[PDB]
A = this chain, B = another copy of it.
Amino acid sequence: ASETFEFQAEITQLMSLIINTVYSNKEIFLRELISNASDALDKIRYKSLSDPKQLETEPDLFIRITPKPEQKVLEIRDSGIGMTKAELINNLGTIAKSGTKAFMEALSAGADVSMIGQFGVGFYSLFLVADRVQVISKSNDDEQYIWESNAGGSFTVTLDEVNERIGRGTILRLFLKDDQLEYLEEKRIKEVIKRHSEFVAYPIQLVVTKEVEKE
């Protein structure tokens, strides 16, 4: 089953600005998504203190970044609290309304795009380097769903019947723009992660496939 909903106006407006902005420091997108992942892990960590059984679906708390060159895709995974179908819709398509409107207002007044996280809508910074995104989430309270959007004013939510089933958490599958493929490179990804992830209290794993070279 697949359902389509429309973003609140202000969210669609910010996604348009961001997906076409010229900004010269797009690497900030990773810092924002790592921050959100850290937040999602904290939520499950907290909940598990009194409800340890909640971790059993996925015992390990981590953030995993997996570049997928063949598909020009970059996946940012966390074993956080995840999102139910209802949460994906609300959290990503509606509740950010006032944040994106305030941020849009700040940008017009001259603020730098890097301030996005300060307005709680850092999530949309992904469109700085991707023209499409699939958010695959598995919450202990629901089935695995796929939320998708190419910044067209609307988004769809589909019961996951194609992706690998995860124990618990969220995956942000970024379909990178053709001129932003540097973010598939281990070296570049590494440099960006180390630049702002000192605070992160969970392991940040990088999954890379490399053909054994030589001396």
A165-198 vs B, Cβ < 8 Å mask (1 yes, 0 no): 0000000000000000000000000100111011
Q: Are A210 and B215 in contact (CB under 8 A)?
A: no
- How many Å lie between the Cα of A203 and that of B64 in the bound state? 25
Q: Is the interface of A mostly helix, strand, loop or mixed?
A: mixed
List the B side residues contacting A209 at CB < 8 Å.
64, 205-208
Contacts of A3 in B (CB 8 A): none
Q: Is A212 an interface residue (CB 8 A)?
A: yes
Question: Contact check: which of B205, B211, B212, B213 meets A212 at CB < 8 Å?
Answer: B205
What are 11 A-B pairs with beta-carbon distances under 8 A? A60-B70, A64-B209, A194-B213, A195-B215, A198-B214, A203-B211, A204-B211, A205-B212, A206-B209, A206-B212, A207-B208
* A164 interface residue (CB < 8 Å to B): yes
CA distance A212 to B210 in the complex (A): 16
Query: For chain A, which range describes its interface: under 10, 10 to 19, 20 to 34, or 35 or more residues?
Result: 20 to 34
Question: A65's closest neighbor in chain B, by CB?
Answer: B212
Of chain B, the residue at the smallest CB distance from A63 is B212
A5 to B38, CA, bound (A): 50
A57 CB to nearest B CB, Å = 16
B210 with A205: CB separation less than 8 A: yes
Contact residue among B70, B203, B206, B215 (Cβ-Cβ distance under 8 Å from A198): B215
For chain A residues 84-140, which have a beta carbon within 8 Å of chain B? none
Closest to A64 in B: B209
